[PDB]
Amino acid sequence: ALPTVQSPLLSSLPGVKHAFFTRQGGVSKGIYDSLNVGRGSQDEPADVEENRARIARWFGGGPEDLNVCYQIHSTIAIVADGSWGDARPEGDAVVSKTPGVICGAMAADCAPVLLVDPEARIVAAAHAGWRGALDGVVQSAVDRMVELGASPANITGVVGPCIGPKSYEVGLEFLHRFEADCPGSGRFFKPGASEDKRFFDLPAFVLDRLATAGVERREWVGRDTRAEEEWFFSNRRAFLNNDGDYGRLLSAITLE
C-alpha cells in the first residue's frame, strides 16, 4: 500500500526486501504531511511513531524490527543483530546479517544508500550527506559489512532519492573543500547561477565512493527530492520557504 521507489538492482533479490520511501502514506500534518519518520523533528512524536510503524509493517515486521540511528553525518557504521527498541544509537549506517532486522537511514536531500551481499546474506543502509560522503561513510559501511563476512566484489549498492545535480547549489568554500580533500572530485561540480556558485552532483559523487569501495554493481534511482515536492521532503526547499523544520524520508532494507 505504501508508495515506494524501488531499484531493479535490488528488487530481483529473493529473501531481501528494500524500499526508498516517499512522503506519502503517513499520518503527519502540515509541513510533515503524511510519512515523516524523523524522531528528532518537531512533528508530533506519536505521529512519527505511527509512520515508522507503517513502514515496519510494509516490511512484514513491527516497530521493534526497525533500526535507525541518531544520525550525525559521521562515517560510523553500527551493526544491528536485533531490535534497539526506541533507542537511537549515534551513527550514520546500519548493518546486519540478522533476518528480521530492518536497516534504515533517514534523509531529506542527503543520499540514502542501500547495500547488500546476496551470497554472504548481509545488508546495510547508509546516510550519505555531503559530509559523510566526503569523509568516507560509504567505505565505512562496506568495511563493516566485510567484518560480518561480505565481499566488496559481490556487493550491490544503490543510491536513493536525494537532492539532484540540477538542484544542489553550493558555494566556493564547499567546492574548494572537495577539490582539496578529495582529489579529482572537481568533476562532480557544474556551472552555477554565478561564478560564486556551483551545482554539486551528490549522487554521482556517492556512486564514485561506491566504486572506489569496490562496489561494482551500482546505480542512482534518479529521483530529485528538492524538485519533486509531490513525492519528497526537502531540507533545501524548506530553507527557501523559511520552514523551521522538515519531514524526513526513510530508506531501508532487510533480510527477510
TrEMBL record:
SUPFAM superfamilies: CNF1/YfiH-like putative cysteine hydrolases (SSF64438). Keywords: Hydrolase, Metal-binding, Transferase, Zinc. It catalyses: adenosine + H2O + H(+) = inosine + NH4(+); inosine + phosphate = alpha-D-ribose 1-phosphate + hypoxanthine; S-methyl-5'-thioadenosine + phosphate = 5-(methylsulfanyl)-alpha-D-ribose 1-phosphate + adenine; adenosine + phosphate = alpha-D-ribose 1-phosphate + adenine. PANTHER family: PURINE NUCLEOSIDE PHOSPHORYLASE LACC1, UNCHARACTERIZED PROTEIN YFIH. Belongs to the purine nucleoside phosphorylase YfiH/LACC1 family. The keyword Transferase applies. It comes from the Bacteria. GO terms for molecular function: copper ion binding; hydrolase activity; S-methyl-5-thioadenosine phosphorylase activity. Gene3D superfamilies: CNF1/YfiH-like putative cysteine hydrolases. It comes from Caulobacter vibrioides (strain ATCC 19089 / CIP 103742 / CB 15). This is Purine nucleoside phosphorylase. The keyword Hydrolase applies.
